[PDB]
């Protein structure tokens, strides 16, 4: 699932994980596992 409501989540993680994907669900963020 792709999110777009935070203070730069997928970013700080994308650096670590990579791919633009993420496991962020609900008001509970959680980048993906690339």
UniProtKB/Swiss-Prot annotation:
Compartments reported by the entry: Secreted
Keyword check for Disulfide bond: yes
Gene Ontology annotations for the cellular component aspect, listed alphabetically: extracellular region
Top-level division of the source organism's lineage: Eukaryota
Keyword Secreted: yes
Disulphide linkage map: 13-19
Function as written in the Swiss-Prot or TrEMBL entry: Blocks voltage-gated potassium channels Kv1.2/KCNA2 (IC(50)=0.12-0.8 nM), KCa3.1/KCNN4 (IC(50)=1-2.2 nM), Shaker B (IC(50)=2.39-80 nM), Kv1.1/KCNA1 (IC(50)=37-45 or no activity, depending on the study), Kv1.3/KCNA3 (IC(50)=150-180 or no activity, depending on the study).
Family from the record: Belongs to the short scorpion toxin superfamily. Potassium channel inhibitor family. Alpha-KTx 06 subfamily.
UniProt protein name: Potassium channel toxin alpha-KTx 6.2
Residues of the full protein shown: 1 to 20 of 34
């Amino acid at each position: 699932v792709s999110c777009t409501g935070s203070k730069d989540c997928y970013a700080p993680c994308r650096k670590q994980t990579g791919c633009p994907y993420g496991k962020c669900m609900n008001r509970k963020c959680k980048c993906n596992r690339c």
